[PDB]
Design an enzyme around this catalytic site. Sequence first.
Site, short mmCIF file in Angstrom:
data_model
loop_
_atom_site.label_atom_id
_atom_site.label_comp_id
_atom_site.label_asym_id
_atom_site.label_seq_id
_atom_site.Cartn_x
_atom_site.Cartn_y
_atom_site.Cartn_z
N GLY A 198 0.70 -1.09 -0.13
CA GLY A 198 0.22 -0.24 -0.23
C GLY A 198 0.61 1.30 -0.07
O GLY A 198 0.94 2.13 0.33
N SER A 199 1.84 1.06 -0.84
CA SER A 199 2.67 2.47 -1.34
C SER A 199 2.38 3.09 -1.51
O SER A 199 1.84 4.65 -1.12
CB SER A 199 4.06 1.72 -1.47
OG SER A 199 4.76 0.79 -0.79
N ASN A 200 1.13 3.43 -2.38
CA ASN A 200 0.12 4.30 -3.04
C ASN A 200 -0.64 4.65 -2.24
O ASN A 200 -0.68 5.93 -2.30
CB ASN A 200 -0.09 3.48 -4.54
CG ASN A 200 0.81 3.14 -5.36
OD1 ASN A 200 1.62 4.78 -6.08
ND2 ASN A 200 0.41 2.28 -6.47
N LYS A 216 -17.04 -15.38 -5.76
CA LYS A 216 -16.70 -14.16 -5.57
C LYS A 216 -17.53 -12.97 -5.86
O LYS A 216 -17.62 -11.44 -5.12
CB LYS A 216 -15.61 -13.80 -6.94
CG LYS A 216 -14.71 -12.74 -6.82
CD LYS A 216 -14.54 -12.63 -8.61
CE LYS A 216 -13.21 -11.54 -8.44
NZ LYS A 216 -12.48 -11.34 -9.70
N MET A 242 -4.93 -6.39 -6.45
CA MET A 242 -4.28 -7.76 -7.04
C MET A 242 -5.28 -8.52 -7.16
O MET A 242 -4.99 -9.17 -7.11
CB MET A 242 -2.93 -8.09 -6.60
CG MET A 242 -1.90 -6.99 -6.47
SD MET A 242 -1.31 -6.63 -8.03
CE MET A 242 -2.16 -5.24 -8.51
N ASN A 291 -8.06 2.97 -11.98
CA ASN A 291 -6.72 2.19 -10.73
C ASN A 291 -5.41 2.61 -11.79
O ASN A 291 -5.47 3.35 -13.05
CB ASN A 291 -7.20 0.57 -11.98
CG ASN A 291 -5.95 -0.24 -11.71
OD1 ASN A 291 -5.42 -1.00 -10.12
ND2 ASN A 291 -5.14 -0.67 -12.85
N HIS A 350 -1.60 0.96 -13.41
CA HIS A 350 -0.66 0.57 -13.74
C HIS A 350 0.62 0.01 -14.19
O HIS A 350 1.41 1.22 -14.52
CB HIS A 350 -1.39 -0.53 -14.85
CG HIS A 350 -0.69 -1.99 -15.33
ND1 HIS A 350 -1.08 -3.07 -14.50
CD2 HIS A 350 -0.02 -2.15 -16.68
CE1 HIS A 350 -0.35 -4.29 -15.13
NE2 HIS A 350 0.14 -3.18 -16.49
CL LIG Z 1 1.47 0.25 -3.13
CL LIG Z 2 -2.93 -3.54 -12.51
CL LIG Z 3 1.65 -0.52 -8.59
#
Ligand SMILES: [Cl-]
Ligand SMILES: [Cl-]
Ligand SMILES: [Cl-]
Length: 180
Positions: A12-14, A58, A83, A100, A102
């Site tokens: 969870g760096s973002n 799911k 992910m 999202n 990428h």
């Molecule tokens: Cl991250």
């Molecule tokens: Cl991705």
């Molecule tokens: Cl990433």
Amino acid sequence: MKKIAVFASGNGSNFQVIAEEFPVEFVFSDHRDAYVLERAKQLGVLSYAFELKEFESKADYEAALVELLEEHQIDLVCLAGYMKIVGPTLLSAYEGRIVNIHPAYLPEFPGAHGIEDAWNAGVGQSGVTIHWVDSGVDTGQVIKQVRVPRLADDTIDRFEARIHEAEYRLYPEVVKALFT
Ligand SMILES: [Cl-]
Ligand SMILES: [Cl-]
Ligand SMILES: [Cl-]
């Protein structure tokens, strides 16, 4: 002003960067032992967590997500290291409201490990792509794209770090335009 929710499966760096420049309603993790839960505890950000193992399917898993989003009146869902494929249950509720990031210059090297795919290919430049989420895998409308170069004395650690740093600067910028 939009209420933002963050989905993170790992470090969870973002999420760390987003939460420091944008008010985050809550952050979700599909792993009860993910480090992103630690960051949320330090930033004073609400955090929910449940795994796929705890559900029959799911659909029921994403049903709990939808109820959770609707409860907090979420207007935008940021996938920051999530992910897991977004199923039709979640798409039916938040279509055109899910962004999202990428670690690859889409549509080049899509998937879970876009960094390793680009590094094993030997391409001179990769990149970072922020886009919307639809039914397809990384086939949504591109919001922002930048190129990330590959150096000569580049290890898989040095190269991965350059991409992540590009993510830390691009993500708040893109959200800043979409937040209002
Ligand atoms: Cl991250
Ligand atoms: Cl991705
Ligand atoms: Cl990433």
